[PDB]
Amino acid sequence: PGAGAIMLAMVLHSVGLPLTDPNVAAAYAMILGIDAILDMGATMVNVTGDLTGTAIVAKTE
Amino acid sequence: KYIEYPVLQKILIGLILGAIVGLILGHYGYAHAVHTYVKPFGDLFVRLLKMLVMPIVFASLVVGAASISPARLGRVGVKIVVYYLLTSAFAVTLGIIMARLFNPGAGIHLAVGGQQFQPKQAPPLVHILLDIVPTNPFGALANGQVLPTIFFAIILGIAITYLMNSENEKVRKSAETLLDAINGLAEAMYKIVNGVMQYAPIGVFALIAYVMAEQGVHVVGELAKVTAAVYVGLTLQILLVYFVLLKIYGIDPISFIKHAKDAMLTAFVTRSSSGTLPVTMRVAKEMGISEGIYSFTLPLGATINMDGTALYQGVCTFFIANALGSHLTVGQQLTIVLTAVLASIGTAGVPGAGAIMLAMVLHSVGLPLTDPNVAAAYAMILGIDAILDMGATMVNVTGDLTGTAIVAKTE
Amino acid sequence: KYIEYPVLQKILIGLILGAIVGLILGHYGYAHAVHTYVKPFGDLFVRLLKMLVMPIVFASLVVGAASISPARLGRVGVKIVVYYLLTSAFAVTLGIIMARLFNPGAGIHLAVGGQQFQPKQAPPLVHILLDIVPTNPFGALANGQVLPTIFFAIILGIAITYLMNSENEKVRKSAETLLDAINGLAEAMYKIVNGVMQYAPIGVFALIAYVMAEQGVHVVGELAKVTAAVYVGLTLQILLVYFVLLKIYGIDPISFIKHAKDAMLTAFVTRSSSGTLPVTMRVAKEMGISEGIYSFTLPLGATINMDGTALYQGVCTFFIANALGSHLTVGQQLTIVLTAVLASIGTAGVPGAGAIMLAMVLHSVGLPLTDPNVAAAYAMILGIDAILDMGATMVNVTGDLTGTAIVAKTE
Amino acid sequence: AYVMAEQGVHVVGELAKVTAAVYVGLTLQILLVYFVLLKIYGIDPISFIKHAKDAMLTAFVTRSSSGTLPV
Ligand SMILES: N[C@@H](CC(=O)O)C(=O)O
Ligand SMILES: N[C@@H](CC(=O)O)C(=O)O
Ligand SMILES: N[C@@H](CC(=O)O)C(=O)O
Ligand code: NA
Ligand code: NA
Ligand code: NA
Ligand code: NA
């Protein structure tokens, strides 16, 4: 759970914004407060696409 | 090589210039370049200004407690305290009354729902007290320790004094040799505090160079709203309270700022009351106040009386409760004042420790630091921080000087 | 009970005696027993000689900067600087030109082939300078800190001078009391520095008792050859550079070592410029140099001008390049100079910190320390180290007296 | 590829000589002690290395008895 929210950092760093700047971290924080609420829907489609990835490959094997 | 242009010209010249060099280089993303190249010159300034604090506070206080009555320290003190608290207490309610008039934080919707908790609290008072009495004064000196130094120099000056009215007039010889040389030092340091101060022009340019590059950019929207209510609030303390308390105690308000700036401007750009002190003290002397007063109301004020911190502490505490829509109202409004006085008395005398203190006052009301949106909002303030810190410090100091001058025109 | 046989007899007496007790005790495997039994006496000497460094450096400078014009400090400084750089940069070339003349390391076959890497570099200059300004000068004293101390006593001395030129003749009284009592101290230290130095005969005996015991036996084969190359390189800096710069500046070259040894025989046997300095300074005074010079050019050179270090740092860099067969040639020979200077300026004033710096100079050229045969070769030098360290320090110090006496004959 | 890259160059002077001393010492344990104890115990000395290498060429290159063991 939410290691994706921690990972969100990597993807932030790739573009401009760096984590050190208060308003970067200010916004990220807010997101870290809505996080497991996202994480729910997130995980249900991390797995649903794992099942469709299996079923449609074995329907071809 | 200037050769010597006047200082309050070059000082005020580098201030308005490096503020623009800083803001331009800052908003064009160079603030790191600025923190590489410029910064270390605005450092050397504060470096030299610190270098003096330890002798100049110890020396000047031995002398000044020798050249005043034990009776009168003890009156000037109880005076400065009950004046210090009253000024500090006013600055909070003058902050609440600015975040009520303005509205920073409101208009960023972000509420949250959990407290207190439980919570904790208790400043270990007993230990802070026993602590002003140092156990090696050589020690105390040797590593910062201004408050425990005070309580020595006061004890020493009082004892030398006593040595001079003693029967055997061999000791009164020694008693003089000591107190002369001690004054030798103190006097010397006030000469060095002019030395540095010809460096100030550079140091002042290169300080708001860096402070304006690396945090001007953040003065935006609802954060900008926190600046204005604080700034317009600090420059309302100056006018509504000091000039009034100077006028009332019949000391000239405009001649007072006429003493200056020197310490008003080293307070602003350094954002260090402790680093200011030498300059702060040399504008006590140069304005004629008595040494047995100013060398003990100013090193105590440099920590205990931070009107400018406990103002921003008021209005920052409002911003983070506004951004969450938690309306604070009767009881808390009143327990902000108490605790932001506390939090500033409180704060240390160095850069943005007032902001770190801001945590004690938040936790005092509902909101606790752990809750992401609490912290999200606090983080934002931690980006407008050094910009508040400047004005905060310049009033933390100007309230010390008016405190001094107004107590000493009664004594 | 000697009762008092002459000092340079009894110090030169235990020197040539204890080098023989030590080599006999050490090559017959006892060097442990000698670091048990003898050593605490060679120690107690360096103990006593340290004890003074702090007052004697502080007090004397205050006085010497008071007793001269701010102008002339500024002029004796820039001089001593551009002198010191120049002496140090020759000493590497005179070290290169000795490990070219001898051949230390070549004749041991051990090659390796991986560099640079990348590599790194940049002494943080900004911060070493800003550091010479201490922020607690009580502090700085209270713990070693010689360079920050210098930057105070110079500003204090200068401040006092100005106080004696002030209208109010009550502060001129205080000013005198101070500078007088301060000179009270300085003077006193110079008396105790004779106290010890009657102990030096024992101490010198008991220092090379040990350094020769535990490191003589290693002066063998390719290692003896770096010794010869450095030692013959060192007593040829003395002759070709000092005596020549002394003659030229019209000061008597033989009457100069005739000032001595004292500072020449504590520098050698302590291997500490910092522990010497009391004896280094007392033979600046005793030979008639003015205090407003020697109490500022001897504590600065005590760290900044290390001729004997920057010499063995060139010929040790060679030894390690030759043992690996890594030939250095055009570009590196010149950037050994630059670096072995930097590395000695550079080195700390205490035992074998120069052998520890040798690393910084190895990595400036190809070889990195990690590779087994670089470190194998470096390990051998760490066993000839305190033996090189002796002469090395004796010329670090001798290059500060000459640098002092030749600048003071110009001022 | 690597062990020769980062440690071949050092086999030089007195160091090459411990190499020679060990290496010629090791291929003389093989001959004088194994082949002889194999012969004597009536197992075929050349048919024994003929078992191999496999365990002889992972033992050499891994420098791990523990990592060899499966082979
Ligand atoms: N740096 C401030 C403290 C603060 O308000 O953050 C001062 O010297 O007063
Ligand atoms: N022992 C030397 C330092 C060195 O060359 O290792 C000194 O005091 O100058
Ligand atoms: N690498 C060796 C051990 C050794 O001789 O260093 C082994 O696996 O047997
Ligand atoms: Na203050
Ligand atoms: Na405070
Ligand atoms: Na030296
Ligand atoms: Na050095």
Residue numbers in the entry:
A (entry chain B): 356 to 416
B (entry chain D), C (entry chain E): 6 to 416
D (entry chain A): 214 to 284
Quoted passage from the original study:
Glutamate transporters, or excitatory amino acid transporters (EAATs), reside in the plasma membranes of glial cells and neurons, where they catalyze the re-uptake of the neurotransmitters glutamate and aspartate (L-asp). Key mechanistic and structural insights into this family of transporters come from studies on an archaeal homologue from Pyrococcus horikoshii, GltPh, which symports L-asp together with three Na+ ions; however, it shows no dependence on counter-transport of K+ under the conditions tested. GltPh, like EAATs, is a homo-trimer. Each protomer consists of a central scaffolding trimerization domain and a peripheral transport domain containing the substrate and ion binding sites.
To determine the structure of apo GltPh, we used R397A mutant that shows a drastically decreased affinity for substrate. When fully bound, GltPh-R397A crystallizes in the outward-facing state, like wild type GltPh, except that L-asp coordination is slightly altered because the mutant is missing the key coordinating side chain of Arg397. These results suggest that R397A is suitable to capture the apo and ions-only bound outward-facing states for their structural characterization. However, removal of Arg397 may affect local electrostatics, potentially altering ion binding; thus these studies should be interpreted with caution. Note that Y317, which forms cation-π interactions with guanidium group of R397 in wild type GltPh, interacts directly with L-asp in GltPh-R397A.
